[PDB]
Design a protein around this ligand. Structure first.
Ligand code: CLA
Ligand code: CLA
Ligand code: CLA
Ligand code: CLA
Ligand code: CLA
Ligand code: CLA
Ligand code: CLA
Ligand SMILES: CCCCCCCCCCCCCCCC(=O)OC[C@H](COP(=O)(O)OC[C@@H](O)CO)OC(=O)CCCCCCCCCCCCCCC
Ligand SMILES: CC1=C(/C=C/C(C)=C/C=C/C(C)=C/C=C/C=C(C)/C=C/C=C(C)/C=C/C2=C(C)CCCC2(C)C)C(C)(C)CCC1
Ligand SMILES: CC1=C(/C=C/C(C)=C/C=C/C(C)=C/C=C/C=C(C)/C=C/C=C(C)/C=C/C2=C(C)CCCC2(C)C)C(C)(C)CCC1
Ligand SMILES: CC1=C(C/C=C(\C)CCC[C@H](C)CCC[C@H](C)CCCC(C)C)C(=O)c2ccccc2C1=O
Ligand code: SF4
Ligand code: SF4
Lengths: 61, 74, 80, 160, 148, 739, 130
């Protein structure tokens, strides 16, 4: 995955679970949740972006 | 008749409340799942949205039309 | 006293700490995020349960979680 | 006949209801003067009441013991104009409404600002979609066949 | 009238079932609270965040469904009592005609049959039904304190 | 480049009409959830958060006032047009005591033409309870052409006010200094508006209403009554009815004002022909009011070395108990629109209630006292408006405290000292509320349980333990003795309610001494208790709007917020808005009890018919004295008994009242869904509904969200008020029109 | 006029502490101000600062912290909050390590940190009878 890639959220406790988002940036450092994904639908708190782990996102073909 | 019907409603609400309590504090997904596949009870939480949506549809259908006919007669 | 837990989804944006009305949360060094900081709850005896901390949390399903528990004159907000 | 009911054309209580309503209207008519608009309105009321009762009598309508038309909605085509034909009419109209709404939602859902086009309707596109709903039974059973009617697993689910 | 009131009963049953089933299935979590199981069956809320989380627990679903159960049982008992009052008094034509519209219920069941009850005690005297009028007013008072 | 206005401040363009939410910084970005739609209407008139300049807020308020006055003028024009075209006003003029006023006919569709009632005068329509016919008769309007011309003038005036609002927002908007000339504004509103309006109305009454109504009462038919302009061009048509116009204005300028006693009287009582106040008394009243208000308008210093400065008056009113006194209040009321709104709305609602009382107490229109539906509707409507306006004044006081209150500018003044001992005020008001409620209501419950136990001598009744309102009876005696003793130039008491003779017009009672017994004692103390509890809720909201022992920084959360959280044991409804919500509920309770007391007392002990030999028979028969002292009595002899007309209205011309009765019950019960439930359940149900929509690919882009907590409360209270007030509306109207 | 010269020029309000902050605990906030600014008390109304040492007593930690948050608007930062038990048992509370909790300071250890997200919490049925 990279910037601009489309991924499916696999985190169950997510307002965008099973949904598709756009990767903003994948951090190359040793952070726990490097993948930053932007969504079109705001969550219940109003935010439309979140940091996800490498195993919590699945790239769409 | 009134006494027994009120007791009936109370008992039904209690049954559903204790089902909810079982879900909260006694339900174990691991026991009700074998190799990814889910048993008859665990599958009720998979189409829970379907169940709730169709209960909502039936309730709205009946309410809309019963009230409509009653108000039309009124 | 209520229970406050911090989860590694913390991005160290400090919005929880600066929203606590009773000085329960603080920012401590960390190496799990870009900011290099994570929220901590070392003074939960002053936690009142107002949940302002998790109203300011930007992470998806929260990184600070408040579990209401036993009540105390401090946690009940009793000036008397 | 069906359910112990009898046709309203042979229901004495139905004619009693008609006679009582007409008598009340005429008694009301007596307290006004000449060809004044109140008398014209009451006379129109009497005429409409008589026409409605006559039409209900000659309508294959079954009346109970209260002299009121009862609806036979078990499904028989004999009393098909009471429920079945209005049912088909409503199903057509409501399917039209739902189809045009869904088509508009899916059409402006692929534009740059989908939310803007929901408070500020694209009236040209809205008119284009709305007049295309007359084929909603055919369009629905041409999109369901192609799998374009139902989502599969991109739909979101709660934690449990 | 029986048809319409049976459909009202079906609506009440379906709505009470909807509330209770929704509370039971959503007890372990939802989109607004994907960790509701960690807070137990009965908790006040999850706070004003995320748009507001009033009455989000499964206990609150029971609490809301109690009103619908009371309403459904009230409809059932109203129907039964009015049908049997008309049957016993002999004026079954009163139910068959007035039970098809709401004002028929309000006027011919409640307003009509409440006359003996409210005259259990008047500024002139009282009857053995006086205790029932007192209980009537007591129930109204407790109902409105619940409203409080 | 005027010194009072700015020229062409805002361009007249339709561009912002196509951008909803442009006023708000947060809503301008566009909707993302359905909460945006509700926030759009909740912030439309909150001009404080739309601009950071007091000048812009003032200009918006000024133009909004113009729009509101245009709406009011359009409403009045519609009323006059309906009177001209769809009314039986001409027939009612010739038979005021036997024709029911109707000014709205109903189209013949879906069988609704049954609503066209037999109002009399060869007319079919809806009976009118707004009293426009009596007002028009008091104005001297004797033809429907005059009503048409008044409607045309109302339309022209409405367009003029619309143009004025547009002009003063887009072409010449006044500056802040112009708005802050409170001395000049008070001078003008007191002299010009009030005094000159009273003077102009006195002139109209004297020259048009006095002769035309005198001719009408003499039996002259409206067709042979001269046109109103002829009473001005001809000094002989008015000098025959009032033989003092023959002297012209010479007695006025020669200080010989005694000559004008023909048409400027001081009589009191009511006109025996029409049952209303003497229009000569009304004209004299308006003249005196005009002079008093014109004099009062020359008080504040505006542009000369003459008059008062409100700042100097307030700052001099200090005291040992009040510290700095009123210092800083002038700055508060000249820099905060919310404080002015609070004061004006509170006094405006109180004035509306006072108007409602004085209306039925002293009927000011001809043939309005014998139109019981009109009297009941006018009283109930004005009391409802007063209660709503008072709650609004409390709400805007709380809003001022949250938003526009500056602690530094109010050091040790009255506002500061009130906040400093808010605990004492609220605790003592709590004790007073408990005392009053315990006593009033528990005396009611004691009466109920003594009656239920067969102990009739243990009640708080007149034939039992008696609580005579001696203080009110003393006042009643003082007023009935006033003519000739304390008001020596009066011929009759101000109102026959205080005592005197039974005034009947066409065998129908207009006014009669309202006896006060133990039943009135209990209901008056119920009124006091309910008013005190409403004041408690609203004052607790205002005083604790900024901080408390629970939330020391409640002002940082704003005026409108749902809570601070489930902590501290639970901090629901701590806002100040949530206090205007509960206070709205309690105002509904209080006003409902007030209007119930009025309806039952009037029907039972004032209204009715008078036999030719002088025997008075009332609508209900005097059951108020003995059966209004128990809750079962209120339930049975008032609610159950007088609800008979509403429930038996089906098939008649009052069936609309039964339908609205049922619908208002439905709406009131509907409110309880929002009042009793919470947002989380509805959000989680919307989750499953959204799942179904997504399964069918029909989920809207604007994400559907359950109504916010505050909006849920607002919807609940609005539906509750609408349902309750509509139920009482239908009940009152059907009952008082049937009988 | 007042018991101590460092008290803010407050006229006293019936919203201060009660019998609880005489036998359970009381909170004192101290700060130094350059100007005698007029500020709003967390309990009652308006008080006047001293151009120097200022000391205020409250019944709750939240009241002292609300006052301190208000002080930040006056560019006052050196405010410090203490807890006093029934006797003179003073404990520094708010600037616990001399650095505000919003700023990261070395020497702080994470308290209440879980090395997983919310979804990793154990099922309640496995936490029965412990
Ligand atoms: C045989 C049937 C049965 C049994 C064994 C239980 C057993 C239990 N229930 Mg349960 N329940 C039942 C029926 C039953 N319930 C029914 C029928 C309902 C629907 C109304 C409920 C609704 C329900 C809820 C919503 C909850 C429980 C809970 C519980 C658990 C704790 C109970 C508790 O703390 O009591 C506490 C007892 C009281 C608070 C006393 C209440 C008394 C009420 C108010 C009536 C008293 C007023 C009286 C009529 C006065 C008359 C007034 C006069 C003027 C006329 C326990 C395992 C709780 C739990 O945590 O489960 C794990 C819980 O949250 N139940
Ligand atoms: C007379 C009062 C009243 C009315 C009309 C309703 C109506 C409704 N409630 Mg309800 N409710 C009420 C009081 C009322 N409630 C109270 C006091 C409580 C206790 C807090 C609840 C608690 C409650 C819960 C917990 C739930 C409902 C649900 C529903 C819906 C059921 C479906 C239905 O009938 O659709 C038909 C709708 C109507 C007949 C009413 C609206 C139609 C109007 C007249 C249209 C007019 C257009 C112009 C419906 C909107 C359920 C729901 O949302 O299902 C989807 C649900 O989950 N209600
Ligand atoms: C117009 C598009 C549209 C379509 C195709 C559907 C379709 C559906 N809705 Mg639905 N809904 C809509 C609009 C729509 N809805 C709107 C606007 C609302 C807000 C009031 C809802 C609220 C709603 C609820 C609360 C529920 C559904 C449910 C359902 C499902 C069962 C049918 C039903 O109960 O009807 C429900 C229909 C209504 C309650 C009335 C809809 C109001 C109007 C008629 C629709 C709006 C017309 C729109 C403005 C047209 C503009 C298009 C034009 C610009 C081209 C079905 C998937 C139920 C479900 O999940 O069952 C599976 C359910 O519980 N819907
Ligand atoms: C602002 C107050 C007000 C109100 C509440 C009404 C209300 C009404 N007017 Mg009305 N009217 C008003 C002002 C008002 N008018 C003014 C200012 C004028 C002068 C131009 C008129 C001139 C007028 C005429 C000439 C007629 C009415 C009619 C009506 C009735 C039917 C309206 C209708 O179906 O229109 C539907 C409107 C639309 C669908 C447009 C959207 C209704 C009771 C009619 C009536 O009562 O028929 C017997 C009728 O013929 N009005
Ligand atoms: C004698 C002079 C005079 C008169 C009669 C009025 C009358 C009025 N003013 Mg006003 N005002 C005046 C001087 C005057 N003002 C001065 C000198 C100032 C500057 C301090 C203001 C500042 C001011 C503000 C800021 C506001 C008012 C408002 C109002 C209205 C109150 C609403 C009401 O009671 O409805 C009664 C309504 C009527 C009786 C309808 C007929 C009234 C018409 C419009 C005559 C208005 C007289 C006007 C000043 C003449 C100017 C004409 C123009 C060509 C120059 C009322 C129309 C309020 C309002 O509603 O805004 C529109 C409002 O917000 N005034
Ligand atoms: C002179 C009168 C007056 C004026 C100028 C204002 C002005 C204001 N009020 Mg206010 N208010 C008033 C009277 C007034 N109010 C009264 C009498 C009350 C007591 C009920 C209140 C209670 C009140 C509260 C509680 C709040 C305000 C707020 C506000 C501000 C924003 C208003 C807004 O955007 O609403 C836009 C308009 C609407 C949203 C309209 C809503 C529709 C209403 C509720 C229903 C009306 C139904 C109608 C009768 C028809 C029903 C018939 C049915 C059959 C259909 C604004 C400064 C709010 C604020 O933030 O202030 C800063 C706020 O929170 N006011
Ligand atoms: C019928 C229902 C009802 C009743 C009885 C009350 C009663 C009261 N409300 Mg209210 N309230 C109601 C509905 C009701 N409310 C609703 C629906 C709402 C929602 C908006 C509110 C919202 C509300 C607010 C927001 C406030 C109140 C307040 C008050 C209190 C006013 C002080 C008073 O009179 O106390 C005296 C008590 C009574 C009159 C009740 C009856 C007592 C009897 C007659 C005498 C004593 C009986 C005796 C002790 C019995 C002993 C025997 C027993 C042990 C067996 C009082 C307790 C205010 C408050 O806190 O108090 C100051 C207040 O601020 N209420
Ligand atoms: C009523 C008592 C009254 O208004 O006396 C008036 C009394 C005199 O106060 P002052 O002399 O300080 O008022 C002077 C200026 O403030 C003018 O308002 O005011 C109070 O002390 C308020 C205490 C209310 C206590 C409620 C009992
Ligand atoms: C018609 C007829 C018949 C038949 C009958 C039948 C077949 C019936 C059935 C019936 C039925 C079939 C019924 C049922 C019901 C059910 C119910 C009523 C249920 C409920 C449920 C619940 C309450 C649940 C709970 C829970 C939950 C929530 C979850 C968890 C678990 C539990 C389980 C706890 C016969 C042939 C005999 C004869 C006559 C005719
Ligand atoms: C009903 C109505 C209307 C109408 C109104 C009107 C018509 C009004 C009028 C008004 C008027 C018509 C007024 C007038 C006024 C006048 C005046 C106010 C005057 C005054 C004067 C004076 C004050 C003087 C004084 C003097 C001098 C200065 C010198 C010499 C001496 C003397 C003392 C004489 C409209 C349509 C709008 C709307 C609806 C309602
Ligand atoms: C039902 C309900 C909702 C859901 C209600 C919603 C989503 C409102 C939906 C309104 C629709 C979409 C528009 C209005 C449709 C009406 C037919 C229009 C009004 C009728 C006119 C005559 C005015 C809440 O969000 C809520 C929040 C807090 C406490 C209680 C409740 C609550 O009870
Ligand atoms: S509740 Fe949330 S905000 Fe209030 S103190 Fe405990 S953590 Fe800080
Ligand atoms: S949600 Fe309802 S309950 Fe939970 S905090 Fe906000 S208000 Fe109090």
């Amino acid at each position: 995955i990279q910037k601009g890639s489309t991924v499916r959220i696999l985190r169950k406790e997510s307002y965008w679970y099973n949904e598709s988002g756009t990767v903003v940036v994948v951090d190359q450092s040793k952070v726990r949740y490097p993948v930053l994904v932007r969504f079109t639908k705001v969550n219940y708190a109003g935010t439309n972006t979140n940091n996800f782990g490498l195993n919590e996102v699945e790239e769409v073909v | 008749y009134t006494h027994h019907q009120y007791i009936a409603g109370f008992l039904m609400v209690g049954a559903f409340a204790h089902g909810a309590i079982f879900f909260v504090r006694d339900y174990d997904p691991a026991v009700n799942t074998r190799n990814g596949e889910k048993n008859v009870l665990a599958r009720m939480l998979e189409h829970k949205e379907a169940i709730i949506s169709h209960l909502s549809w039936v309730s709205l259908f009946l309410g809309f039309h019963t009230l409509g006919i009653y108000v039309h007669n009124d | 006293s209520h229970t406050v837990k911090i989860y590694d989804t913390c991005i160290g944006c400090t919005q929880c700490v600066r929203a606590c009305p009773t000085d329960v949360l603080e920012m401590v060094p960390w190496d799990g995020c870009k900011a290099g900081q994570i929220a901590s709850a070392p003074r939960t005896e002053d936690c009142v349960g107002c949940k302002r901390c998790e109203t300011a949390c930007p992470t998806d399903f929260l990184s600070v979680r408040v579990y209401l528990g036993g009540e105390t004159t401090r946690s009940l907000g009793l000036a008397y | 006949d069906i359910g112990g009911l009898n046709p309203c054309k042979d229901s004495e209580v139905f004619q009693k209801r008609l006679a009582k309503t007409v008598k009340k209207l005429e008694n009301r008519l007596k307290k006004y003067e000449e060809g004044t608009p109140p008398q014209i309105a009451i006379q129109q009321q009497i005429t409409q009441t008589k026409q409605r009762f006559t039409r209900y009598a000659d309508s294959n309508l079954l009346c109970g013991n209260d002299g009121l038309p009862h609806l036979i909605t078990d499904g028989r085509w004999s009393h098909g104009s009471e429920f079945l034909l209005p049912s088909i009419l409503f199903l057509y109209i409501s399917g039209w409404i739902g189809w045009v709404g869904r088509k508009y939602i899916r059409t402006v859902g692929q534009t740059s600002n989908p939310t803007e086009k929901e408070i500020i309707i694209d009236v040209p596109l809205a008119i284009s979609i709305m007049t295309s709903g007359f084929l909603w039974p055919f369009a629905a059973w041409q999109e369901f066949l192609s799998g374009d009617l139902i989502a599969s697993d991109e739909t979101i689910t709660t934690s449990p | 009238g029986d048809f319409l009131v049976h459909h009202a009963i079906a609506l009440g049953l379906h709505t009470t079932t909807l509330i209770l089933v929704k509370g039971a299935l959503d007890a372990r979590g939802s989109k607004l609270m994907p960790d509701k199981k960690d807070f137990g069956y009965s908790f006040p809320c999850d706070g004003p965040g995320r748009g507001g989380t009033c009455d989000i627990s499964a206990w609150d679903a029971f609490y809301l469904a109690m009103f619908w159960m009371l309403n459904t049982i009230g409809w059932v008992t109203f129907y039964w009592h009015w049908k049997h009052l008309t049957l016993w008094q002999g004026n079954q034509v009163q139910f068959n005609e007035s039970s098809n519209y709401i004002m028929g219920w309000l006027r011919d069941y409640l307003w009509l049959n409440s006359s003996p009850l409210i005259n259990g005690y008047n500024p002139f005297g009282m009857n053995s039904l006086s205790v029932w009028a007192w209980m009537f007013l007591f129930g109204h008072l407790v109902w409105a304190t619940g409203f409080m | 480049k005027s010194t009072i206005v700015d020229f062409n401040p805002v361009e007249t363009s339709f561009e912002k009409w196509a951008k909803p939410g442009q006023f708000s910084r947060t809503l301008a970005k566009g909707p993302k959830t359905t909460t945006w739609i509700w926030n759009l209407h909740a912030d439309a008139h909150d001009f404080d958060i739309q601009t950071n300049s007091l000048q812009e807020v003032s200009r918006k308020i000024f133009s909004a006032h113009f729009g509101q006055l245009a709406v009011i003028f359009l409403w009045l024009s519609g009323m006059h047009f309906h009177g001209a075209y769809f009314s039986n006003y001409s027939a009612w003029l010739t038979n005021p005591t036997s024709t029911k006023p109707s000014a709205q006919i109903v189209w013949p569709i879906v069988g609704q033409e049954v609503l066209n009632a037999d109002v009399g005068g060869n007319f079919q329509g809806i009976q009118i309870t707004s009293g426009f016919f009596q007002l028009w008769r008091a104005e001297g309007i004797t033809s429907e052409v005059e009503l048409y011309w008044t409607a045309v003038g109302g339309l022209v005036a409405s367009f003029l006010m619309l143009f004025a609002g547009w002009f003063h927002y887009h072409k010449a908007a006044p500056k802040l200094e112009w708005f802050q000339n409170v001395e000049s504004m008070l001078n003008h509103h007191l002299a010009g508006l009030l005094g000159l309006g009273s003077l102009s109305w006195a002139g109209h009454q004297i020259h048009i209403a006095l002769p035309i109504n005198k001719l009408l009462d003499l039996g002259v038919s409206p067709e042979e009554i001269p046109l109103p302009y002829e009473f001005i061009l001809n000094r002989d048509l008015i000098a025959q009815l009032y033989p003092s116009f023959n002297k012209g204005l010479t007695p006025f300028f020669t200080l010989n004002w005694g000559e004008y006693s023909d048409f400027l009287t001081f009589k009191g009582g009511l006109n025996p022909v029409t049952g209303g106040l003497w229009l000569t008394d009304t004209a004299h009243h308006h003249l005196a009011i005009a002079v008093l208000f014109i004099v009062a308008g020359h008080m504040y210093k505006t542009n000369w070395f003459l008059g008062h400065s409100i700042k100097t008056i307030l700052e001099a009113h200090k005291g040992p108990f009040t510290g700095e006194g009123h210092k800083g209040l002038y700055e508060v009321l000249t820099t905060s629109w919310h404080a002015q709104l609070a004061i004006n709305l509170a006094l405006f609602g109180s004035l509306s209630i006072i108007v409602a009382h004085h209306m039925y107490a002293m009927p000011p229109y001809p043939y309005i006292a014998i139109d019981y539906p009109t009297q009941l509707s006018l009283f109930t409507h004005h009391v409802w408006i007063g209660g709503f306006c008072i709650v609004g004044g409390a709400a805007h006081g709380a809003i001022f405290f949250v938003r526009d209150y500056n602690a530094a500018n109010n050091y040790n003044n009255l506002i500061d000292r009130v906040i400093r001992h808010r605990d004492a005020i609220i605790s003592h008001l709590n004790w007073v509320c408990i005392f009053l409620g315990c006593h009033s209501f528990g005396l009611y419950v004691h009466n109920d349980t003594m009656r239920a136990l067969g102990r009739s001598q243990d009640l708080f009744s007149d034939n039992a333990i008696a609580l005579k309102p001696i203080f009110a009876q003393f006042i009643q005696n003082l007023h009935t003795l006033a003519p000739g003793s304390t008001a020596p130039n009066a011929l009759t008491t101000v109102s026959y309610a205080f005592g005197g003779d039974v005034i009947s017009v066409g065998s129908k009672i207009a006014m009669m001494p309202i006896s006060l017994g133990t039943a009135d004692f209990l209901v008056h103390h119920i009124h006091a208790f309910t008013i005190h509890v409403t004041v408690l809720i609203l004052l607790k909201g205002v005083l604790y709007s900024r901080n408390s022992r629970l939330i020391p920084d409640k002002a940082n959360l704003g005026f409108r917020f749902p809570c601070d959280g489930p902590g501290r044991g639970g901090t629901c409804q701590v806002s100040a808005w949530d206090h205007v919500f509960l206070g709205l509920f309690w105002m509904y309770n209080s006003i409902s009890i007030v209007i119930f007391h009025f309806s039952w007392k009037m029907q039972s002990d004032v209204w009715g018919t008078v036999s030719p030999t002088g025997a008075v028979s009332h609508i209900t028969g005097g059951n108020f004295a003995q059966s209004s002292i128990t809750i079962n009595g209120w339930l049975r002899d008032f609610l159950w008994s007088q609800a008979a007309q509403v429930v038996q209205s089906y098939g008649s011309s009052l069936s609309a009242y039964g339908l609205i009765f049922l619908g208002a019950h439905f709406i009131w019960a509907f409110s309880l869904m929002f009042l009793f439930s919470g947002r989380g359940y509805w959000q989680e149900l919307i989750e499953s509904i959204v799942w179904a929509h997504n399964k069918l690919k029909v989920a809207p882009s604007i994400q559907p969200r359950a109504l916010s907590i505050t909006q849920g409360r607002a919807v609940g209270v609005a539906h509750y008020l609408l349902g309750g007030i509509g139920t009482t509306w239908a009940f009152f109207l059907a009952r008082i029109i049937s009988v | 006029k007042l018991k101590q010269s460092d008290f803010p020029k407050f006229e006293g309000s019936t919203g201060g502490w009660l019998s609880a902050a005489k036998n359970e605990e009381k909170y004192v906030i101290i700060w130094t101000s350059k100007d005698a600014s007029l500020f709003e008390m967390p309990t009652g109304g308006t008080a006047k600062m001293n151009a120097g040492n200022n000391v205020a007593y409250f019944a709750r930690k939240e009241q002292c912290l609300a006052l301190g948050s208000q002080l930040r608007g006056f560019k006052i930062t050196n405010y410090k909050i203490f807890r006093i038990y029934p006797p003179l048992d003073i404990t520094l509370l708010h600037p616990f390590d001399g650095v505000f909790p919003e700023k990261v300071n070395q020497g702080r250890s994470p308290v209440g940190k879980r090395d997983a997200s919310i979804g990793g919490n154990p099922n309640p049925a496995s936490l029965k009878f412990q």
